[PDB]
Design a binder for this molecule. Structure first.
Ligand code: FYM
Ligand code: FYM
Ligand code: CL
Lengths: 148, 148
């Protein structure tokens, strides 16, 4: 559970926002890309796994699950690549609610920057700091408890 | 001390590698950019502070220290922007040694990818996982101890 992440892809302004959620904490990382490709997803996962101890990734769709480039990145980074089938039906709603929240925050800051990527990183910051513990606090505590 | 980071700028293949080091752990984040500008540095710090609890940043040079865009990003993200004067003379050597190590790793993986940015993220991964604890383990433990 400390090492479990979920990929999520949402759309805004004709661009793609790729999100990784640490399932146990709600902590996120995100990036803007022109379109979701295997190569972009693979690079995103490489970045993620260099920064946090990623054991398992539930992929966001079948194309990324199938992608040999994504499989290669997961091999390289020591990640178990899994499907994202919501065996628990509450998973759909949770991700739906997160995308809605994220877009709301992006709207609240969108005029503080020209580029969507800047607004998305502001939204990541606000989400991860929001308190009673924050997602940023929870992920660190969860992983530290695991290490020891 | 848990919140203290240092910026570092190094060059390879006619490009710039921008690095943030968590001083107490040696944990790093890095990105490739075509050139170091205030805007690029500001965006990099915004990303960093959304991901880790950044209290203080020692800037890498006077241009980034002076930059109103960098100052604005630090204001936005709640970061105390400081100079990077090595009051401790061992700081020069430590960063020098880190850039050398990073470039060595980049060389060891450079043929596993076309794009320099990919090789740099592989290097970040290897650095942060290298064991006796790893830098990734140390940063989580340091911050978790602080939170509690
Ligand atoms: C992250 O450091 C920051 C520092 C200050 C601010 C304060 N905001 C502004 O000054 C502003 C507001 C706007 C605008 C254009 C700007 C100025 N830019 C240069 C900010 C910026 C800076 C760096 C990278 C960026 O993107 C890679 C962008 C970006 O614009 O996205 O157009 C509509 O409202 C926002 C971000
Ligand atoms: C983390 O995802 C990875 C998965 C597998 C691999 C294995 N390596 C290769 O297959 C390879 C080796 C090469 C090469 C070109 C490639 C193929 N590319 C598409 C890899 C790649 C993928 C994604 C984004 C990328 O860059 C944004 C790049 C990139 O090339 O930088 O040219 C010289 O040696 C490397 C990375
Ligand atoms: Cl790690």
């Amino acid at each position: 559970s400390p090492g479990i992440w979920q990929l999520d892809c949402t759309h805004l302004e004709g661009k793609v926002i790729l999100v990784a959620v640490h399932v146990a904490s709600g902590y996120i990382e995100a990036e803007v890309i022109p379109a979701e490709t295997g190569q972009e997803t693979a690079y995103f996962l490489l970045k993620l796994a260099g920064r946090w101890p990623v054991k398992t990734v539930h992929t966001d769709n079948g194309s990324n699950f199938t992608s040999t480039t994504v499989k290669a990145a997961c091999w390289w980074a020591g990640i178990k690549q899994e499907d994202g089938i919501p065996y628990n039906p509450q998973s759909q709603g949770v991700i739906e609610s997160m995308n809605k929240e994220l877009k709301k925050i992006i709207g609240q800051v969108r005029d503080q920057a020209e580029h969507l990527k800047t607004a998305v990183q502001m939204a990541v910051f606000i989400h991860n700091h929001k308190r009673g513990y924050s997602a940023g606090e929870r992920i660190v505590d969860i992983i530290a408890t695991d290490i020891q």
